[PDB]
Amino acid sequence: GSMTLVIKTNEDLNKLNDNIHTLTIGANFNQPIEHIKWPKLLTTLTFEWYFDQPIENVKLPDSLTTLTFGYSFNQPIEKVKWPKTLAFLTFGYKFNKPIEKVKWPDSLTTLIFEENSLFDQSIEKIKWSNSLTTLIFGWNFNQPIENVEWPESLTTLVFNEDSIFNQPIENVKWPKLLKTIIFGCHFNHPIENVKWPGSLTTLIFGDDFNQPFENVILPKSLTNLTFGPNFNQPLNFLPESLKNITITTNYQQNLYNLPSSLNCIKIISYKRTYEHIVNVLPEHLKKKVIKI
Amino acid sequence: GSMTLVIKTNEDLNKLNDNIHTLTIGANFNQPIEHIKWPKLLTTLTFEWYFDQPIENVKLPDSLTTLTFGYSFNQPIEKVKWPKTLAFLTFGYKFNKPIEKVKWPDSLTTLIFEENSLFDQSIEKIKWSNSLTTLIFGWNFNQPIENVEWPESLTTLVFNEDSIFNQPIENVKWPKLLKTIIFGCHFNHPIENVKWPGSLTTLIFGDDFNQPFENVILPKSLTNLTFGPNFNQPLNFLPESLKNITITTNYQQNLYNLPSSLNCIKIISYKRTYEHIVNVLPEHLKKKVIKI
């Protein structure tokens, strides 16, 4: 007897019962759900492309460990009674609604936004789940984080490589267990007055990031450090416990004061810049340049 | 009244008559055509992929202005009686036969080889039609041209950007009205003693081209000059007529001597190399560097 179900038609609603632990909705159209009786032992629920219906007054089974929202979903969620055992939550492309007053279940460990998520709302007043370990943002998120109470359970914080996030972070208070921080394309802010968590092992910067490292100090635990095409600042005071570094061919600074023991140095070959040609040009012709 | 036909089968030959001005031999048709009576006012003829049959003993109508050969066509043509009004001839990929005794009709203006044409035969003894204006070579053509009798009607000479053509050209007799010369990837020979035509407006060089321009004089008619990635020679005596120039980011020379009256200086960015960061790296760490 079957325990998985994909309700494509309106006919398939007669097919759901309490033996269904895996459910999929919204394959072909925005199926309304306000008056559906959910299976008592539902473990996974996936909302497909077309689904967009309010949920603030829908009681999902507390059995639900995994919930995925689809392309079209965009509704307020600050009023929702989340399942008690929800651990994994994924949000779709079109969802952009305030969550600053949401009541997370303390069982949530992973929160992921879609790669190109429209999500751009303030989060400085949020109460994170005490079990949150992984938080992944999308393309369009750009809000300050200097006054966010990160839970001590947080180990991984990731922005999409094409994130437009660019805010000051010098007054951020990181948790003591945060292992991985990954910034995106647009982040370029001073980091001299940042106290990184002593448990930090992986730190990744993006394209636009180019800041000085003369008054910076990194944790003794740092082992993986990557840089972007625009980073052209000297590296003298890197921690001697560093293991892997990554830089680009746009880097034109001396590397005599780098730590030993580095088991990998990755250089990323990028398309070269133009200054070395424009500088050796006649002044009256520098305005006549086309950069391809 | 249909005046257009595509022949795919032996049966379709019965659809031939004198009303057909546009004829196409189907992709799968590979049959002898020595005994075909061709439409009297045939204007355009196209052979598709699989056609490979002798044509020396075929008399195509004199009204045929546009003629095209397909992928598989590879047959001797030096004995062919070409139409009195042929203007546009195209050869396919697999065509590779001598053309030095061809007897072109004086109406031929345009001769094109397919992009990857295997055509590689000497042409120094050829008699060009007095109306040839545009001649385009393919990939594999590499034969001397210094002793070629070019017709004074030739305006455009092009090698494919991937051409393996690499021969001396310092003794070539360029026609007076030649206006566009484009060289391919592999051309790399001195041009110090080349007498460029006084009507030349466009000259393009390819990737491998790296020859000095100290003792070079270009016409006061030249407007467009292009160089490739390997070009790293100083440019101190370009004509004051030049309007557009193209270079790459691999150009490590000063350009203070560029002409005024330039309207556009195109700089193409290429993938940078790694040595400029390795030669400034701690000696004991250079071993473990990984290049991507």
Author numbering:
A (entry chain EEE), B (entry chain AAA): -1 to 290
Excerpt from the paper describing this PDB structure:
The FGxxFN repeat proteins belong to a larger family termed FNIP proteins (Pfam PF05725), which in turn appear related to the large and well-studied Leucine-rich repeat (LRR) family of proteins. The structures reveal a so far unique hydrophobic packing with a buried phenylalanine spine and thus define a new sub-class of LRR proteins. Their perhaps most striking structural feature is a fully buried double phenylalanine spine that originates from their diagnostic FGxxFN motifs.
Crov539 and Crov527 represent the second sub-class of the here analyzed repeat proteins with an LxxLxFGxxFNQPIExVxW/LPxx consensus (supplementary sequence file). Crov539 has a short and curved core comprising 12 regularly shaped repeats. This core is flanked by a compact 15-residue N-terminal capping module. At the C-terminus, a unique domain swapping arrangement occurs where the last repeat(s) (261–290) of the first molecule extends across and caps another molecule to form a dimer. Dimerization is also evident in gelfiltration experiments.
